[PDB]
From Swiss-Prot:
Changing residue 174 to F: In Hawkes bay. Ca(2+) 2 binds at residues 10, 252, 256. This is Albumin. The record marks 1, 17, 38, 61, 70, 90, 103, 133, 156, 171, 178, 187, 192, 202, 209, 237, 259, 271, 283, 356, 369, 386, 399, 411, 429, 433, 463, 472, 497, 516, 521, 535, 538, 554, 565 as: Not glycated. Transmembrane segments: none annotated. It is linked to Hyperthyroxinemia, familial dysalbuminemic: A disorder characterized by abnormally elevated levels of total serum thyroxine (T4) in euthyroid patients. It is due to abnormal serum albumin that binds T4 with enhanced affinity. Analbuminemia: A rare autosomal recessive disorder manifested by the presence of a very low amount of circulating serum albumin. Affected individuals manifest mild edema, hypotension, fatigue, and, occasionally, lower body lipodystrophy (mainly in adult females). The most common biochemical finding is hyperlipidemia, with a significant increase in the total and LDL cholesterol concentrations, but normal concentrations of HDL cholesterol and triglycerides. The keyword Transferase does not apply. SUPFAM superfamilies: Serum albumin-like. It is found in: Secreted. Belongs to the ALB/AFP/VDB family.
Length: 572
């Protein structure tokens, strides 16, 4: 079975010529684009010889072998990959394992910098195949562990924005907003894939399955616990393998899970019809982002089996993870409106309760009212979402972001100004995205988007530690991470920042700037305003903000004239 030829079929020549490009670009991050093009063309030509004759020359070697063979022929030594060239002296599965250990992950590559809209649409027109292929090359060499089929999914959406906006009226009003959402979603996926690999190693796979049972029970409410438990086991085995870095081994386990799910749709979900009729690449991908199946009508209460029962301590003791997983599965399938972390708080609370009750003379009397403990935990994110979405409606996205700047700078003023501006604007975005949902779908939307922003804040703070309270909340636990950040009181031991005079100086270049960039600096100064006087309160801050609005809108030169009056007047 010639694997290079079989891969070429059922996957398509176009997807083959793109995955081979992403694959080699993830290893040879230093080699130029045109050098990569020949290698993809050479592998494509060689694959075509195996397509025309499966038992031809060098067509009997498997995927890792021909990959490793072609990779060890590029004068890899002395060209950055000196150590990676030493992998050639090994053989499978040591040579490929050696290749994975030498992915740079942090290559000293310049910021990509997008060209002008007219330049891109012209380059996209005159040479579309070369234009898009350079896009895959430049992104794959900077994200060496980004799952290649997933990176290919973004390339299609990248091309869809160019075909529509390049033949339009105001192209920049069409293309540029699509590219930013595309680039933002690309960073979110990259950080999500890493957060899940780090969560697997830091906290162990016992807690990883708990996250998977809850999410899968919400996704597949019409599935038995045994099916959900098997899907969680296989899904964990896939993530454990895909975090090693090997694309080929990750893809095969990822395709076997989709095949099993499509063969057992009648015992998993009713919403996997059009999902399972997609090709190999999209099948595994679409199932990951599948809508929750309809909840089974007339589901009994969890009072019977988990709090009343007759004897439940015996059931919990023999399997202190299965019985907790059955409670999590039954609670999650009934509450698709809860976040995954909320359901884990209820289970962990139900866990700590049983161990204190089953360690008592009358365990039943100890756990007789365990469900009263869940009400405060369910109402805590609900009140936070409603209090913040309502404050978002009466403010708009911008003024909601500024209310978050003041609130979070006063909590941790030690955080750098560019990080406080970035995190607060992204936290305002989850308001513009999730408050447009009803209460039945607001908590999961917030959980998914907050997990992206809160992790981005942590990885920035991890590389440059600054606050102990940010460090504790960032390394506590992924279940208690959000309640940790929301429980931060304002910093009382913080000494006010010194009045840097130039920081509050503006120069009328902000008059004609950029709607984002103009308010980036308008929000940067607001952070520096709060850092200088951390005891200003909203009334005085709304006064200085109102005084700045009249100073900026009118005097737009005078920025030094009226500016000096503002600084002295604000000193109050
Ligand atoms: C975001 C891209 C990650 C790439 C590696 C993913 C490895 C594991 C993904 C395999 C899942 C296949 C679909 C499983 C169906 C479960 C749906 C769900 O994830 O909630
Ligand atoms: N992702 C995500 C997350 C976060 C935190 C913790 C954990 C986790 N995990 C698990 C699962 C299941 C299903 C789907 C997805 C997922 B992940 O990986
Ligand atoms: C910089 C500190 C960020 C703190 C984030 C507080 C934002 C609160 C908004 C409502 C939180 C909703 C969380 C739902 C998921 C969960 O149960 O934690």
């Amino acid at each position: 079975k010639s694997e290079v030829a079989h891969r070429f079929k059922d996957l398509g020549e176009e997807n083959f010529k793109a995955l081979v490009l992403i694959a080699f670009a993830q290893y040879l991050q230093q080699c130029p684009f045109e050098d990569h093009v020949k290698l993809v063309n050479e592998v494509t030509e060689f694959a075509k010889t195996c397509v025309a004759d499966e038992s031809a020359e060098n067509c009997d070697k498997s995927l890792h072998t021909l990959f490793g063979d072609k990779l060890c022929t590029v004068a890899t030594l002395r060209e950055t990959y000196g150590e990676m060239a030493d992998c050639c002296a090994k053989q499978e599965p040591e040579r490929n394992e050696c290749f994975l250990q030498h992915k740079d992950d942090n290559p000293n590559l310049p910021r990509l910098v997008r060209p002008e809209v007219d330049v891109m649409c012209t380059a996209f027109h005159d040479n579309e195949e070369t234009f898009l292929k350079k896009y895959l090359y430049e992104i794959a060499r900077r994200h060496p562990y980004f799952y290649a089929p997933e990176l290919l999914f973004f390339a299609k959406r990248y091309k869809a924005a160019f075909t529509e906006c390049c033949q339009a009226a105001d192209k920049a009003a069409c293309l540029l907003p699509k590219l930013d959402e595309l680039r933002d979603e690309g960073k979110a996926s990259s950080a999500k894939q890493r957060l899940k690999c780090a969560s697997l190693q830091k906290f162990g796979e016992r807690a990883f399955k708990a996250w998977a049972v809850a999410r899968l029970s919400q996704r597949f409410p019409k599935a038995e616990f045994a099916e959900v438990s098997k899907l969680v086991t296989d899904l964990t085995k896939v993530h454990t393998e895909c975090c090693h870095g090997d694309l080929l081994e990750c893809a095969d386990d990822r395709a076997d899970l989709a095949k099993y799910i499509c063969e057992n749709q009648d015992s998993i979900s009713s919403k996997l019809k059009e999902c399972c009729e997609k090709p190999l690449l999209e099948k595994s991908h679409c199932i990951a982002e599948v809508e929750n199946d309809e909840m089974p009508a007339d589901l009994p209460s969890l009072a019977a089996d988990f709090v009343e029962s007759k004897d439940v301590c015996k059931n919990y003791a023999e399997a202190k993870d299965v019985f907790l997983g059955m409670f999590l599965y039954e609670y999650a399938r009934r509450h698709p409106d809860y976040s995954v972390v909320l359901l884990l708080r209820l289970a962990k609370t139900y866990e700590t309760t049983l161990e204190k009750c089953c360690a008592a003379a009358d365990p039943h009397e100890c756990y007789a009212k365990v469900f009263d403990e869940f009400k405060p935990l369910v109402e805590e994110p609900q009140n936070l979402i409603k209090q913040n979405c309502e404050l978002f409606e009466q403010l708009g996205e911008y003024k909601f972001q500024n209310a978050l700047l003041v609130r979070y700078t006063k909590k941790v003023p030690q955080v750098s100004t560019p990080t406080l501006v970035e995190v607060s604007r992204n936290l305002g975005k989850v308001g513009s995205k999730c408050c447009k949902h009803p209460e039945a779908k607001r908590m999961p939307c917030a959980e998914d988007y907050l997990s992206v922003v809160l992790n981005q804040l942590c990885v920035l703070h991890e590389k440059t530690p600054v606050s102990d309270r940010v460090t504790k909340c960032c390394t506590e636990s992924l279940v208690n991470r959000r309640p940790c950040f929301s429980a931060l009181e304002v910093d009382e031991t913080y000494v006010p920042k010194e009045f840097n005079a130039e920081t509050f100086t503006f120069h009328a270049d902000i008059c004609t700037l950029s709607e984002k960039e103009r308010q980036i600096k308008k929000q940067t100064a607001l952070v520096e305003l709060v850092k200088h006087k951390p005891k200003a309160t909203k009334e005085q801050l709304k006064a200085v903000m109102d005084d700045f609005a009249a100073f900026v809108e009118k005097c737009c030169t005078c920025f030094a004239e009226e500016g000096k009056k503002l600084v002295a007047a604000s000193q109050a």
